[PDB]
Amino acid sequence: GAVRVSAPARLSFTLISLDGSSLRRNGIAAMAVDRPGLTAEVREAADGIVAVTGTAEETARELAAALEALRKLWDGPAARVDVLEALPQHSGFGSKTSTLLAVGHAYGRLCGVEPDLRELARTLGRGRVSGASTGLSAYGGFLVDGGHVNPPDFAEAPQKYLRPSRFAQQVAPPKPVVRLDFPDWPVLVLLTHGRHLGGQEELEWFHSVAPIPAEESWRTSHLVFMGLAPAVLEQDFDAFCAAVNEITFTGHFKQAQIAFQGDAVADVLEAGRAAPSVDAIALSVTGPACFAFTKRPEDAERWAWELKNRGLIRDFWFTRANNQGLATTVVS
Amino acid sequence: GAVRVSAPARLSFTLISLDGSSLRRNGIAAMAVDRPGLTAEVREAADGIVAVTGTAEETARELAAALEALRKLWDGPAARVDVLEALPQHSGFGSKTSTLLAVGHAYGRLCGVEPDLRELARTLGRGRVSGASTGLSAYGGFLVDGGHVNPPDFAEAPQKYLRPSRFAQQVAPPKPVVRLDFPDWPVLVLLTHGRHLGGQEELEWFHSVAPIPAEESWRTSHLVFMGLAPAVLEQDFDAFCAAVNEITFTGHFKQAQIAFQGDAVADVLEAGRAAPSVDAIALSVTGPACFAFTKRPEDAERWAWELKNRGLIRDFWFTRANNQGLATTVVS
Ligand SMILES: O=P(O)(O)OC[C@H]1O[C@H](OP(=O)(O)OP(=O)(O)O)[C@H](O)[C@@H]1O
Ligand SMILES: O=P(O)(O)OC[C@H]1O[C@H](OP(=O)(O)OP(=O)(O)O)[C@H](O)[C@@H]1O
Ligand SMILES: Nc1c(C(=O)O)n[nH]c1C(=O)O
Ligand SMILES: Nc1c(C(=O)O)n[nH]c1C(=O)O
Ligand SMILES: [K+]
Ligand SMILES: [K+]
Ligand SMILES: [Mg+2]
Ligand SMILES: [Mg+2]
């Protein structure tokens, strides 16, 4: 028998608190979508050898390492995971956290354990900046996590803590301060020509932007918690789009992420802004995934199809929010 | 038979968004506490005459009016309500909303209806600034509501919308963006010598302070959503107290509320700040209720007892958060 696990992608609106004077750092607003999706089957490896197929090399190595670590922790069998549908790696879909937690959960189910997904994220070294994929794996929908309390030594050297996930200090994953069902609105996903960053390239860029001005952290909290989140809660489409657009085009950190990718992303965001068929548009992390909202999906479809034919984007599709998170079925 | 209803008081940390340029106005962080509490019994009035006892005159009139309005709406009997334990009126405990919703709910139960408490709040003209007592009646705990979307005509004359509850434009109550269980920490309630405001006095004061600077709205969102709320979620007492103190002593609107009451409140807040037994202290609305947090309740008890004996406060008691909201039992 196998444990078949399905999980949504994570789209990120923004990181929030990245200045040198705040009580807390990070905080992320995010939502779960069905496409791109993860589908994986976990079964007992007859030869006791951990085996992974269907993913990029980096993810395959960390999945193997995770299944070895969990084999020991839960005194369980060697597992083979066949990733039948992989989340695109390093594309703004939170692929690694979402895949590790889904496969870890499915392996848990094989072993007769039901792991706390946040505790499993901690076990696998996730959540040192973002609790987004961790929270959305458990709950789906729209969430804003509370980031991380800044220790007493933060103020004297903030760049010790204000880092990308790969270089961030060891801490537990944040918990969700806000978790809501996303309204039954369609989401337009655009794959831009944006590049994948190098680890050292990203760390140097991050230290060139953070710490951001205190007032910009505050304004970002304001746009997320007193703009995005209430509009989701009240299913107010026009209010939601105004908040998304204010973050995309004026968010200090988000503008830095856009500028780092350059025209490959900025031209698509500008085209979305000019297009009457697109009510709001956003870059997830540094992309290449962008996402858009529309009360005229029929028109936005034709606009995206033309952009793809012209080669200004790689791909586009409509999806809907996932309001559950991961699901599992036992199959042959 | 009677419907016996018990409900907690509402303590307010701060109003959030009160500037002339924001997407939304208001937003309130609040928590429910057991003491002061409401206890009321609702029964059928044999003579078909709506009767209220146990409250101040203003509350008794609005309760009678509410029970008349609901008698018609639900085609039910005339009700007598005996308020056996009243929430102190105009003292920072959200007495009117909390009492109207509890008695309305209990009357509902008498009529064989289970009303949506937020819709009942709308019916009774509550929630034009604060969704705090409305949300806490339903859920208890700690909550931050999302305030109200600012209409297109807001920017040209913000004082049309930025008003106290009594003078605010007709709108539905806000919904909770954040709702959490409060940790099992004790709360010290202090009744100061603060005065009750007049309606015209409050409206003129409010227009003298609002609209507040945009940056102060943003910083208040930051302290509430990226300070108070994550510390509640993570049950981090020191982080919680740092956020409470930053709001009390630096919050732009809160400082204006303190200054309007003067030494009667400011001296108690300053005494709490200086006192090693008090880790954090706060004014609920304009008071006279203040509330405090301590990891040394034994020491804070002796400190409050001395303040009361000296006459710097009227009263003090320890209570705990209510994590349920209103409850009802059918009695003889
Ligand atoms: O734990 P999470 O909420 O997923 O957030 C952390 C990860 O997400 C971002 O990359 P991206 O969205 O591109 O995901 P990936 O790098 O795992 O594919 C970031 O670069 C981290 O790699
Ligand atoms: O709907 P709510 O969340 O209760 O908030 C609205 C009411 O609360 C404040 O007064 P206060 O806390 O003193 O309550 P009261 O004036 O009803 O007693 C404010 O002056 C409003 O009167
Ligand atoms: N989640 C992230 C984001 C984001 O969501 O924008 N940027 N950096 C990170 C990170 O984890 O390093
Ligand atoms: N709830 C309020 C507060 C508060 O909680 O501080 N100040 N004014 C109001 C109001 O309703 O007018
Ligand atoms: K547009
Ligand atoms: K103190
Ligand atoms: Mg990444
Ligand atoms: Mg009042």
Residue numbers in the entry:
A (entry chain AAA), B (entry chain AAA): 10 to 341
Task: Quote the study's own text.
In the specific case of formycin, the enzyme ForT catalyses C-C bond formation between 4-amino-1H-pyrazole-3,5-dicarboxylate (APDA) and PRPP, in a reaction that is driven by the elimination of CO2 and inorganic pyrophosphate (PPi). ForT catalyses C-C bond formation in formycin A biosynthesis, and we have previously determined its structure complexed to PRPP. This structure establishes that ForT is a member of the GHMP kinase superfamily. ITC measurements show that APDA binds to ForT only in the presence of PRPP, suggesting that the reaction likely follows an ordered bi-bi kinetic mechanism in which PRPP binds first and creates the binding site for APDA. Glu211 is essential for catalysis, and we suggest it acts as a general base to make APDA sufficiently nucleophilic.
In carrying out our preliminary analysis of functionally important active site residues, we discovered that the T138V variant expressed, purified and crystallized more readily than the WT enzyme. Bound PRPP and APDA were easily placed in clear difference electron density in the active site. In our structure, the Mg2+ ion is coordinated in a distorted octahedron to both hydroxyl groups of the ribose, two oxygens in the pyrophosphate moiety and two water molecules (O-Mg2+ distances of 2.0–2.2 Å). The interactions of PRPP with the T138V variant, which are dominated by the 5′-phosphate and the pyrophosphate, are essentially unchanged from those in the WT ForT/PRPP binary complex, and the phosphate moieties are found in almost identical positions in the two structures. Compared to the binary complex, the ribose ring in the T138V ternary complex rotates to create the APDA-binding pocket, a movement that is accomplished merely by changes in the torsion angles connecting the ribose ring to the fixed phosphates at each end of PRPP; akin to a seat of a child's swing linked at both ends to a rigid frame. The planes of the APDA and ribose ring are approximately parallel but do not overlap, thereby positioning the π-system of the pyrazole for nucleophilic attack at C1 of PRPP, and the Val138 side chain adopts the same position and conformation as that seen for Thr138 in the WT ForT/PRPP binary complex. For example, one of the carboxylate groups hydrogen bonds to the backbone NH and side chain of Ser174, which orders residues 172–179 of the protein in the T138V/APDA/MgPRPP ternary complex and positions the adjacent pyrazole carbon 4.6 Å from C1 of PRPP. The other carboxylate of APDA hydrogen bonds to the side chains of Ser21 and Gln266, as well as two water molecules that form a network with the side chain of Glu211. The Leu24 side chain is stacked against one face of the aromatic pyrazole ring. Of course, that the T138V variant is active, albeit with a 40-fold reduction in kcat, poses the question as to why we are able to trap the T138V/APDA/MgPRPP ternary complex.
